Amino acid sequence: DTICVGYHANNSTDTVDTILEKNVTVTHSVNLLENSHNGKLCSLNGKIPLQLGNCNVAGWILGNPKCDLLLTANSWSYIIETSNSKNGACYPGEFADYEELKEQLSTVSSFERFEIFPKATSWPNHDTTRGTTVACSHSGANSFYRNLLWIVKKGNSYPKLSKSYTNNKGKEVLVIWGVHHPPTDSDQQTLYQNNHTYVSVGSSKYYKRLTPEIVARPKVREQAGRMNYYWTLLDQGDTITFEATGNLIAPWHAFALKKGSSSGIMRSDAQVHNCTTKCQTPHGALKGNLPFQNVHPVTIGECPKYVKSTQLRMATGLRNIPFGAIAGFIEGGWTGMVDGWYGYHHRNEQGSGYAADQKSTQIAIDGISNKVNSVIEKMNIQFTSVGKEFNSLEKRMENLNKKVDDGFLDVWTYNAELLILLENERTLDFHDLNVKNLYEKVKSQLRNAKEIGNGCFEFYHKCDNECMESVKNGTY
Amino acid sequence: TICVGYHANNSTDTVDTILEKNVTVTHSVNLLENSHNGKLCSLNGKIPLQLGNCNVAGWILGNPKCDLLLTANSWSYIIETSNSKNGACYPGEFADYEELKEQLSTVSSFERFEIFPKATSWPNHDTTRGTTVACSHSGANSFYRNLLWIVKKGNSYPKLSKSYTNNKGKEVLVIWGVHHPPTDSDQQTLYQNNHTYVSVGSSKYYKRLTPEIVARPKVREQAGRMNYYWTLLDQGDTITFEATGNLIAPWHAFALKKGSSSGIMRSDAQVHNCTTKCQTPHGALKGNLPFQNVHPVTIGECPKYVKSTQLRMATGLRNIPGLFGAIAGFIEGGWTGMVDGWYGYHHRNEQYAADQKSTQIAIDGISNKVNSVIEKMNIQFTSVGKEFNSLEKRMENLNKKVDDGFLDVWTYNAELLILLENERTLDFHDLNVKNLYEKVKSQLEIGNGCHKCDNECMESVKNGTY
Amino acid sequence: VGYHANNSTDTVDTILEKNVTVTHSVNLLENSHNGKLCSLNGKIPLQLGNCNVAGWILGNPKCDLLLTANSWSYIIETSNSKNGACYPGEFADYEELKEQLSTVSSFERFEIFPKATSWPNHDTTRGTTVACSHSGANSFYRNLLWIVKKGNSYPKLSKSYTNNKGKEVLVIWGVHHPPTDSDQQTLYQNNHTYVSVGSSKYYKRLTPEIVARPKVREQAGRMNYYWTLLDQGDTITFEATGNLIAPWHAFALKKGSSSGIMRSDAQVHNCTTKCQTPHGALKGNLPFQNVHPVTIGECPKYVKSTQLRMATGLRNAIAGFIEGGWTGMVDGWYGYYAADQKSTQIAIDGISNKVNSVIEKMNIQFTSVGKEFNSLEKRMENLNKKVDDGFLDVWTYNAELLILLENERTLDFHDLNVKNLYEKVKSQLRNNAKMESVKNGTY
Ligand SMILES: *[C@@H]1O[C@H](CO)[C@@H](O)[C@H](O)[C@H]1NC(C)=O
Ligand SMILES: *[C@@H]1O[C@H](CO)[C@@H](O)[C@H](O)[C@H]1NC(C)=O
Ligand SMILES: *[C@@H]1O[C@H](CO)[C@@H](O)[C@H](O)[C@H]1NC(C)=O
């Protein structure tokens, strides 16, 4: 009549790495690394993104006629630019501080387009009906931006223009306008009558006075002239004032903005689908339940922390064998014991049988669960971290931004990789010691029997099922 | 009988471990400072500079409302409040203002000096009429203390030319302005000439401006504007001013000394006659622990800022009035009666004691653990806030990504280090107890740690001789 | 049963105790260099020597040796790199220019506007100056052409170049601001000139201003230098009525890996290295270095540590009832003299795995040298320094604390292997005691 102390074994092929040994097969484990995505752009928590499509932000904000899809867009979760987002300023010219404008829009959660200077009434002394061009052609007729008004002279007079707008929206207002540089003096006079004109735009936080220059630039969309585009964010209660003797591409529509938290701009060619997610990358959406991911650095939503690891497997059970206990004097696990991690086997006159010690097993399960959750809890969820954009004269800032991203990426990959290596080694020694503690618990309790040596004990006396379950209960 | 056992007391202190939360321990040491004195103090005896109702612009330009600041020549740090609103009393823009503040944040002392003495520097122009209602002082039109509004003498404004070579042995902050009158009549009244220019040149700075007659909306009755400019003139370098009008000339400049411990702070807390080695905008810190969660903005030698609400490190053992079966094992509880150490013996014969040998080794080891964690933690020298204009959002967000990124790293390092070291410290005591039992067992068994043998013989067993 | 002892005096720290003598250990810190500037993976660096980048790119005549430079591994500036714009003036966006050149792997100088044929209506033979004197004769930059009037006429200049090289072309030019109206008329005839330079990504129209600046090398005038990167298929167009210091040679560029500009006075030698610092080359085999924070190549992480000694063996059970090690046992870590290859090889495999894991998870720094900020970029400069210093503290902390914690685990690791060997005879001899059969484990 014998009893043995032993541990659990199963058919698991899970391997984990530890600080002392690599690829160790264990009975239970949890993967902490997401390495897959669904290959779709999804809504974030139910809110669709804004797909700029063939338009870029400039074409969107200016109101390029090819971007009319976007005019009613007022609410989105993030902004998508594709490889075909090429429709921008149809009348050629540069947007000043374009990357800053994009950075501003990347946190916008609500966008309300309104007619800041109504076309029909704002400009009684000028002509509002002729500012169209073949460069902004739409459905076979010369056209122009939906959000700007190309004002020209009325008759043969362009009087001094002055127009103010006071923001009473209760939110900041995005105002856009332009300054036109004709290619010849004849075009200057034809459009604006006066020569040597100026355009001045002012608020309490903004001031710029421009003198348009006449220069013939290389032809883009038949245009040797240029329009330089400008924008500013007007605060509640602040007043923006336009003054011009010509060349003013006036605001027609502007946008009352609310800023949110979880949005950004993403560059992706993947398709939007009517799926939803808490975490989106340019390649596809992530499930976002594990603390780490190696799919993409650019995330939007509440996302696992990005690491360069290819695997982050955490040991929870013990070494799978189907302080000298596991693979020691107790040379192997019991696949026959299924209800727990540590337990007993007994040979009897009434028959054989495995039983698991729930007391020590639950303590081990409680401790390891606390270990895993602590590792998950100490890792922070990676709120929206989008891409950042730099112009061609910002290489040092771009490289500074790149050094930051790469430095934290190395730090977090190191911390995760070493934590799992060290915690896995400690977890296996934890189980090893609990078995050794359980072996000594019966040995220091049957001391009437002799240590067979292999985790077992031969009872020098008859020991029935009552006698067995008594030793297990700790009351023997 | 002799019993091997461990210490227990009346402590309710709890610590977290990687395996268990809320573990009551007999001894522990706080590593997280979470309180402040609500005061702005001197740094090691050095008074801060309270700008009060003035901001940096008003101080540097010399807004007449900032005259009381003129007696300040050395400070430990600079304070702006929610009411620091007195700046440019004559409206207009300060160029590269966030850079000027960045430069001044490491200045600990400066010397205001009369770079172009008003009485002698401008013989061919008028220095006696450059006042405005916009800069009123005591009910009279006035002007900046550090700039001079030069106008025409009689009906002529000749070409102005003046140089200054910095021989102060320090960088000199030079400030000036260019006036943009609102009407051609005002241009003629003040400067006679039209189509004027102002040029300012040194070996590291060059700018030629043509003033523009423009009617801006009235601020403090002024439809005109003054644009302010500054530069740091190196030792041995020369700055040259040239103008046919519209020059708001330097009158006073500042020879700067940069110090190791100083910054600009935004705070509404009051200055008091306290001193501190570590200051935040909310109040001063004691600065004894390696971590603090009061504020990211520090001045002095300060604990590292973390987001943690508790950083509790175990030094004693589980408190019971485990891994190795001794503590919370066969010895089911601690001895409140044993007070002289962590591990020891209780004996009973015909006529509690602490094992000083076993206790001292563990005390020596745990002190080393705690000290190592403190020494590896570095003092956080002065880290102030940075400022960005409304067209510097990307840089502002890059700066914030850096602050937040290192903040998350150090919060992780502190919290997880404590979580893992607490587990090892409790397992350390548990193992030291099992070793004390097995040492007695290897000499002489009831089970709970417990020939006639009096005191000489027992105390010998404690001594290890039997 | 016993453990190994030898004559090593190596000391290591652990979280629980400092200065513990160990039988074997490994240093994880490279703290020495060969005091030489070497080639990187086989590619010679570019020594600017007494020229700075401006003098190199403009083609200051004192920089003629550099004209053959087409491929380098990194660029070296010395404390005597002072030959720049010999005719005084500055490059707009000069730190950006340097940042662009810091990543260039191929450089092909070509004659964008051939001086003998590009300017038939202007004079190409008089744009020389005592300020750029060479071999006792007035001279000028090798890469720019100082065009002046032909006879008494300076007609409107118009020259385009279309980039068809299939790679970016660095184009450089200048705009001259004479000190007096007489010099303006003498050089360019016209009084109210302009220079406009345009591509699809660049446009600037400048009106030169006649101003007498302080004399630098006898020049009261100034030349403002400009640069741009012209994309494939794009056209740059120059138009001017005077004051144009025109392109003469430009540069077809290929972008390479993340090398940089180094400030160093060490001498270049015919050595090669995987990792270079301004003080000297590193062997680059260990995961950490404290030689210099400025690295180029595949380099160990920079730390503030003076020592990073990792225990691999045991202290010279241990230091308990067994009051000492056997200096006489030489064949292994544990044994009975004979060493147990099972017990010793298992520990060697594990400790070798621990050492390798610390090294394997450590990444190369791959940093960048010479981040420069102008005098109005102090906030950006301080931001860059906050990043460098912040990671320095993190890695110094991670390295030092890792070594403290793993050393304690290593010394207890050996201690437990001794107890397991000691218990190995007890679970074998049973009650037959108070040889090769016990060692084999079959007794
Ligand atoms: C284990 O056995 C089950 C059948 O019960 C089988 O489906 C599975 O593939 C086997 N292997 C693992 C690793 O679970
Ligand atoms: C979108 O969802 C609807 C209903 O869930 C489904 O009919 C449709 O196929 C989905 N995909 C589309 C519209 O591309
Ligand atoms: C500008 O100055 C000139 C002198 O050169 C004078 O004749 C003219 O009247 C002035 N113009 C105005 C508007 O004051």
Domain boundaries, chain C: 1-43+267-443, 44-266
Closest Cβ–Cβ partner in C15, C375, C380 for B372? C15
Q: Hey, whose CA ends up nearest to atom 13 of ligand 1?
A: A12
Ligand nearest to the CA of A40: 2
Q: What does the radius of gyration of chain A's CA atoms come to, in whole angstroms? A: 36
**Å from CA of A40 to ligand 2 middle:** 14
**Ligand 3 pocket residue status of B188, Cβ below 6 Å:** yes
CA distance B3 to B440: 9
CA distance B320 to B316: 12
Of A46, A108, A36, residue with least CA distance to A281:
A36
How far out from the chain centre does Cα A134 lie?
Answer: 41
**Ligand 3 pocket residue status of B194, Cβ below 6 Å:** yes
CA distance C17 to C39: 44
The approach used to solve this structure was X-ray
Q: Hey, whose CA ends up nearest to atom 7 of ligand 1?
A: A11
**Å from CA of A322 to ligand 1 middle:** 14
Q: Which atom of ligand 1 is nearest to the CA of A11?
A: 1
CB contact under 8 Å between A400 and C384, yes or no, is: yes
Strand partners, C391: none
**Å from CA of A315 to ligand 3 middle:** 88
CA distance A229 to A62: 9
Nearest CA to CA, how far is B402 from chain C (Å)?
A: 7
Of B4, B9, B19, residue with least CA distance to B426:
B19
**Ligand 1 pocket residue status of A11, Cβ below 6 Å:** yes
Touching A: B residues 312-351, CB under 8 Å: 323-325, 330
Beta strands in B259-380 (DSSP E): 264-266, 271-276, 278-279, 284-285, 291-292, 299-300, 304-305, 312-314, 343-347, 353-354
* Record: fold of C44-266: Hemagglutinin (Ha1 Chain); Chain: A; domain 1 (3.90.209)
**Å from CA of B185 to ligand 3 middle:** 10
Per-residue CA distances from A188 to A77, A139, A144, B11, C239 (Å):
44, 28, 18, 87, 21
* A100, amino acid identity: E
Q: At what angle do helices A358-378 and B393-441 cross, to 10 degrees?
A: 150
**Is residue B381 within 8 angstroms of chain C, CB to CB?**
no
State phi, psi for B101 to the nearest 5 degrees: -60, -40
Q: Which atom of ligand 1 is nearest to the CA of A14?
A: 13
CA distance B81 to B52: 6
Nearest CA to CA, how far is A276 from chain C (Å)?
A: 36
CA distance B1 to B334: 17
CA-based end-to-end distance of chain A:
16
Nearest CA to CA, how far is B380 from chain A (Å)?
A: 20
Which chain B residues touch A239 with a CB distance below 8 Å? Answer: 217
**Ligand 1 pocket residue status of A15, Cβ below 6 Å:** no
**Tokens 């590269």 belong to residue:** B96
Buried b (16+ CB within 10 A) or exposed e, B350-369: eebebbeebbebbbebbebb
After which residues does chain B break, using C–N > 2.5 Å?
321, 351, 444, 450
Q: At what angle do helices A395-443 and C341-361 cross, to 10 degrees?
A: 150
Nearest CA in chain B to C208: B208
Instruction: Report the neighbours of B using a cutoff of 3 or more CB pairs below 8 angstroms.
Output: A, C
Size of interface A-C (CB pairs under 8 A): 75
CA distance C259 to C237: 32
**Is residue B409 within 8 angstroms of chain A, CB to CB?**
yes
Most ligand 3 atoms within 8 A of CB, residue of B188, B210, B246 to mutate: B188
**Å from CA of A273 to ligand 2 middle:** 8
**Å from CA of C288 to ligand 2 middle:** 55
Per-residue CA distances from B404 to A303, A376, B305, C234 (Å):
16, 19, 11, 42
**Ligand 3 pocket residue status of B189, Cβ below 6 Å:** no
Q: Residue B162, class by beta-carbon neighbours within 10 Å (0-12 exposed, 13-18 middle, 19+ buried)? A: middle
Touching C: B residues 103-122, CB under 8 Å: 103
**Å from CA of A11 to ligand 1 middle:** 6
Phi-psi region of A126 (alpha: psi -120 to 50; beta: other; left: phi over 0): beta
Residues in chain B: 466
Closest Cβ–Cβ partner in B203, B232, B386 for C379? B386
Please, are residues B256 and B171 in contact by the beta-carbon 8 Å criterion?
yes
Which chain B residues touch C390 with a CB distance below 8 Å? Answer: 402, 406
Which residues, in sequence order, are CB contacts of A398 under 8 Å at separation 6+?
Answer: A388, A390
CA distance B267 to B38: 11
**Ligand 3 pocket residue status of B186, Cβ below 6 Å:** no
Q: At what angle do helices A358-378 and A395-443 cross, to 10 degrees?
A: 170
Measured over the CA atoms of residue B314, residue B315, residue B321 and residue B325, the dihedral's sign is positive
**Is residue B199 within 8 angstroms of chain C, CB to CB?**
yes
3-class DSSP assignment, residue C37: strand
CB contact under 8 Å between A421 and C357, yes or no, is: yes
Which residues, in sequence order, are CB contacts of B193 under 8 Å at separation 6+?
Answer: B157, B244, B245
Among C14, C16, C175, C397, pick the best mutation site for testing chain B contact (most B Cβ within 10 A): C16
Q: Which atom of ligand 3 is nearest to the CA of B184?
A: 13
CA distance B280 to B295: 6
Q: What does the radius of gyration of chain B's CA atoms come to, in whole angstroms? A: 35
Nearest CA to CA, how far is A33 from chain B (Å)?
A: 19
- Within 13 Å and on the Cβ side, how many CA atoms surround C349? 9
Per-residue CA distances from A248 to A94, A156, A188, A212 (Å):
15, 17, 12, 10
State phi, psi for B347 to the nearest 5 degrees: -130, 155
Ligand nearest to the CA of B195: 3
**Is residue A403 within 8 angstroms of chain B, CB to CB?**
no
Q: Per CATH, the architecture of B47-269 is what?
A: Alpha-Beta Complex (3.90)
**Is residue B368 within 8 angstroms of chain C, CB to CB?**
yes
Which residues, in sequence order, are CB contacts of B93 under 8 Å at separation 6+?
Answer: A207, B225, B227, B228
Ligand nearest to the CA of A29: 1
CB contact under 8 Å between A437 and B402, yes or no, is: no
Which residues, in sequence order, are CB contacts of C302 under 8 Å at separation 6+?
Answer: C288, C289, C290, C292, C293, C295, C365, C367, C392, C395
Residues in chain A: 476
Strand B247-250 to strand B172-180: parallel, antiparallel, or no bridges (unpaired)?
Answer: antiparallel
Q: At what angle do helices A395-443 and C94-101 cross, to 10 degrees?
A: 60
Which chain C residues touch A404 with a CB distance below 8 Å? Answer: 387
Q: Per CATH, the architecture of A48-270 is what?
A: Alpha-Beta Complex (3.90)
Buried b (16+ CB within 10 A) or exposed e, A101-113: bbbbbbbbbebeb
Nearest CA to CA, how far is B377 from chain C (Å)?
A: 8
The dihedral formed by the CA atoms of A404, A410, A415 and A421, expressed in degrees to the nearest 10: 170
**Ligand 1 pocket residue status of A12, Cβ below 6 Å:** yes
Resolution (A): 2.3
Q: Which atom of ligand 1 is nearest to the CA of A13?
A: 13
Q: Hey, whose CA ends up nearest to atom 4 of ligand 1?
A: A11
**Is residue A221 within 8 angstroms of chain B, CB to CB?**
no
Which chain A residues touch C95 with a CB distance below 8 Å? Answer: 396
Which chain A residues touch C380 with a CB distance below 8 Å? Answer: 396-397, 400
**Ligand 3 pocket residue status of B99, Cβ below 6 Å:** no
How many CB atoms neighbour CB A12 within 10 A? Answer: 14
Instruction: Report the neighbours of A using a cutoff of 3 or more CB pairs below 8 angstroms.
Output: B, C
- Return the structure tokens found at A260: 């949110």
- Return the structure tokens found at A102: 């994009």
Beta strands in A91-225 (DSSP E): 108-114, 133-138, 141-143, 148-150, 161-166, 172-181, 199-202, 207-210
Strand partners, A449: A459
Q: Residue B156, class by beta-carbon neighbours within 10 Å (0-12 exposed, 13-18 middle, 19+ buried)? A: exposed
